[PDB]
Symmetry: C3
Subunit: 486 residues, 3 copies
């Protein structure tokens, strides 16, 4: 008859790393790194995003003749734009403060197009000959649909003086442009005025522009250029226009209410009719883990980006008639620590739930604390800088690289320390049990040194159960042990 103390073992082949040792096999393990995604675009908090397909923000706003598909978007959460849009500006030119406009238009609560100046408001000017071959429509010359190009009528260009007095209860977005001619003859043929000017004024805007006649290289078969501008009109403000040539008047305006911020995503994947909380250009994430390695650029409440490919926390035991010194028993299934009994009455395994429950609770609490002690907040990441702003881009790159390195180091070191701590805790528990069974039986038996005790006397099944319970009668078998000795 003998009593031994051992620990649970199984056929698991999972491996973890510690500070001192590498490739240690454990019975159970858990991963805290996210590495999967659905590979589709999904709604952000129930708000459908805006997809511009092959168009661009400038082309969509100005009304490119090949980009009239999008006319109904009451609201959106973020904008998805392809990396190299095809139809951006049919007529060569530029838009002032393009990046700021895109950043402002990222997230819009309400959007509606209205007409502010009917085409009938120009009795003394021609409004039908302003077409170009650089903006074809069904094989015919056309122009932008949201603006009107005015030319001379009856060989005369009377001065223009009109004003608009805002009556809606929301802000308005208004766009206008100026055209640069090629030579004096073309300027005379188009406007009859050798020298022209444009004046725009509001409560806060004071602008004056003049044409720049010169020679330029051909773009899309056209040597002219067009420059556009934009502004925001207050609910009770008014805007005044005045020009005598080279003026592109506005026709439609947008009603905008903004109560948030976002950025623009460059991706080519398709919509998927799904709801998510975190979005990446390659897919969506639906994980509660504190770390991930999918993609740097993310929108929304997302885990943190790290370089490591594996972060495994050890939660089980060290995998491998004897005792705890040799190895772990495979015959026991219930519990982590227990006793293997053996006598003439029978043999079997008995577990100790008192310490197993405490160990399980401790490990679970450690894992839960590590997972849940992390704070996350809404963030938007993107590239919003042009050619002549490289210094700020480099600063942002330094930002992201430093944060990535810090997080990677912290996570790796924390995992490495915690694995060893858990292993040492398990060893401490098993030795605590071994000394708990000790110092109670006294000299009635002898310790073979292999984790087992050989009773000199005879201990019944009830006696062994009482030993497990922690209540043992030493004087009951003291004389039997004494006469048994030698």
């Amino acid at each position: 008859d003998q009593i031994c103390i051992g620990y649970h073992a199984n056929n698991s082949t999972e491996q973890v790393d510690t500070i001192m040792e590498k490739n240690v096999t454990v019975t159970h393990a858990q991963d805290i790194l996210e590495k999967t995604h659905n590979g589709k675009l999904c709604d952000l908090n129930g708000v459908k995003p805006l997809i511009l397909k092959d168009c661009s923000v400038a082309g969509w706003l100005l009304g490119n003749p090949m980009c009239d598909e999008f006319i109904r978007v009451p609201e959106w959460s973020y904008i998805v734009e392809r990396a190299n849009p095809a139809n951006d500006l049919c007529y060569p030119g530029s838009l002032n403060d393009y990046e700021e406009l895109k950043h402002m238009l990222s997230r819009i609560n309400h959007f509606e197009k209205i007409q502010i100046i009917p085409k009938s408001s120009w009795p003394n000017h021609e409004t039908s000959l302003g077409v170009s071959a650089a903006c074809p429509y069904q094989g015919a010359p056309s122009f932008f649909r949201n603006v009107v190009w005015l030319i001379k009528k009856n060989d005369a260009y009377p001065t223009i003086k009109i004003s608009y007095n805002n009556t809606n209860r929301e802000d308005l977005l208004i766009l206008w442009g100026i055209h640069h001619s090629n030579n004096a003859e073309e300027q005379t043929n188009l406007y009859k005025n050798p020298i022209t000017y444009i004046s725009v004024g509001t409560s806060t805007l004071n602008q004056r522009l003049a044409p720049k006649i010169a020679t330029r290289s051909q773009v899309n078969g056209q040597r002219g250029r067009m420059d556009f501008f934009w502004t925001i009109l207050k609910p009770d403000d008014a805007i005044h226009f005045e020009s005598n040539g080279n003026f592109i008047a506005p026709e439609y305006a947008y009603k905008i209410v903004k109560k948030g911020d976002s950025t623009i995503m460059k991706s080519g994947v398709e919509y998927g009719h799904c709801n998510t909380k975190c979005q990446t250009p390659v897919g969506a994430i639906n994980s509660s883990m504190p770390f991930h390695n999918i993609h740097p650029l993310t929108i929304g409440e997302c885990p943190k980006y790290v370089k490591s490919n594996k972060l495994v926390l050890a939660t089980g035991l060290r995998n491998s008639i004897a005792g705890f010194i040799e190895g772990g028993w495979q015959g026991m299934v219930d519990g982590w620590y227990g006793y293997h009994h053996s006598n003439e009455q029978g043999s079997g395994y008995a577990a100790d739930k008192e310490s197993t429950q405490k160990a399980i609770d401790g490990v679970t609490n450690k894992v839960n604390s590590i997972i849940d002690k992390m704070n996350t907040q809404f963030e938007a990441v993107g590239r919003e800088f042009n050619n002549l702003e490289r210094r700020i881009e480099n600063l942002n790159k330094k930002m992201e690289d430093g944060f990535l390195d810090v997080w990677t180091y912290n996570a790796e070191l924390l995992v490495l320390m915690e694995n060893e701590r858990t292993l040492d805790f398990h060893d401490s528990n098993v030795k605590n049990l071994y000394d708990k069974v000790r110092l109670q039986l006294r000299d009635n038996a002898k310790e073979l040194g292999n984790g087992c005790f050989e009773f000199y006397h005879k201990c019944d099944n009830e006696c062994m159960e009482s030993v497990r319970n922690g209540t043992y009668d030493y004087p009951q078998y003291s004389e039997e042990a004494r006469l048994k000795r030698e």
Copy 2:
């Protein structure tokens, strides 16, 4: 006759959290988070700040009639400004590079106002008619006090040519402006010349401006605009002015010496006549703790900002005829570890000075190291970007959020781990005392298993003090114990 080992216990109720269990009860604890402030504005290192009350920087500099009295305060550390100043730019207009001037005027030493161009220097121009109803003073039209508005005299406006040596030994700040008319008739009424220009030139400045005549919405009953500019004059440089209309000439200049930098605070709290080191918009904070959660915006040597509400370190034992594994001893005052003694003379308590002193020193060193290993530097945090610089503001917000998350996570994890270590550090010391006593005792007594030893022989107070001291003579009582063993 028995000796038992135990530890201190009291009526405390503080609770601390570990990595494995939540709010175990401990006897003593220390907080390392600061959550209190005096709620007043105080001097920074003995330098009084600048309080503008209901004015703005531009209004204070230009001399708004209903805003400023005189300069005062030749030096200051930071500027306190209300969220929405009332008196600012009575005449509608704008100031060029407002944000840069605001940032540069944060911390200034030896700020003094001097007069450079007396009003007697304009004998051929009118100087007593440049007043407007948009800037009333005691019910009468007035204008800015630091600049002069020039009008035509005797239906004429001769060209102006003036230069200024800077004979002072410090840098000089000069401001001037240009006025935009409303129509040709008004321009002729104010100035005889129909076309005007302004030329300003220094060793590093080359500027030429022209007025812009157009129709604008009326603000404060005025449709005109005034744009102002500023520059820094070197100690031995000169500035040349040349104009023939629409010119606002300077009259006063400021002598400025700068060494350092700070930021502008938006707050409404009052002055309190105190000297602090860290300042927040809601009050002033002084402490040695490494963390705080008062306000994100701070100026000076302030602790780090975290989101947590509680951060408590454990510096004591676990609270709850006895023994080690029963609990604590309420009656055992004056010590952490010690011996409970009971002979035929009587019973009482005794403490082990050495182990308690080592434990106290270790805990104190741990706490002091955690507190003092923090590096603090002077910093100024504030919002200094306009409406057309949203991207940089987003970048700054990303900076602040990332740093806050990193600090919060690291602090929480460190607190949990150190609490875990410190909570069970003392158990090893108590175990060491126990088996030291057992090693000296050997088999002269019997272990009851609850933490005491039942003496077979008689041990008087001298023998008991010898046992505590570490001088036990086995052969002296061995024969008596052998006879009593049966």
Copy 3:
């Protein structure tokens, strides 16, 4: 007659600090902080940097007469420039977008100067009178060598129209400028046209300029000013020029290929003819340590910067014939970390245990190597390129750098203290385990003196002592002898 346990001890005086104790003497220690440099400038990955000596970037590009060092370096890794260059611009003026051009003129794969407009292309204009005393050369007036200052000829200034196709297969860098006069008389004497203009146009450029005539201060004896501009020409684009006065036509153009990105170093150290990997204004760093405290500004893959002065990691034993419970200063053992000292009638000796020593050294080495190796290092170029009117972004950058420095310093110090504390107990645990293993094998044949030794009742000789070290002991063989010895 007795057997004892102990550990190695020596004559080192290294000191380390733990969380609970300070100034603890240890047998062996290792530092993980780099504090040395060669004090020289070296090549970066085999690419020699560009050293401009006393000439600034603008003067080198425009062709300042006092910068006659026309040495050709087709490819450079970074630019070394003095804090206050002397020869920058002989004629007072400014260069548009100077900072962006300087940033773009970092590491360049290919660079060559070619001629695009010969002087013979101006038959109706004077090209020999464009000299000034502000740009002396051998005691004679001169001008920039890369541009031409056009003056009126035969009291006439015909309008200029010219275009240039880029027939090369690489990007082109072109510079031009405009001159500001002082008064009407000077303008008439120089160009004969009271009103002038300049027009420049490409596929993406549309610029128009007009001279500004005013009175300015005297700098270098000249009251005039000169403003220069630059642009990048695509491999199949063209640029058109048109002006009627105050025009400074380009003569030479730079043919450039750009792949990477770098920054500019401000230092005065000399060249060293070395090939390093990390660069610093005060020298070069060659180490694999994760931390350093040399200089905040670095270029390349460099360790992290901290404000600490000492970072020592404990890897040895607690430095100071009975031991194991009392002072373990067993100076006799010089062949291991843990072992036994034996003594009987035959003799004595300081034996050692190989298994425990191997386990301990492997564990400590693994810890040190893991801490050193788990560093992610990437190429980062750190500099300070911001003008006088951009102080807010500079303050933002300074705040970022300070925050990162504080985080790294605090984390490193706390980690070092915690790891020293953790390491200074594994040896104690091993010694206690060895002492326990020595026990429960002799049982009652020996008396545990408590001092860290066992005294056998029976007679055990060298073979029996070697056996008990080996872990094989015959208790019944000496059981009766221990019985008869027990009184």
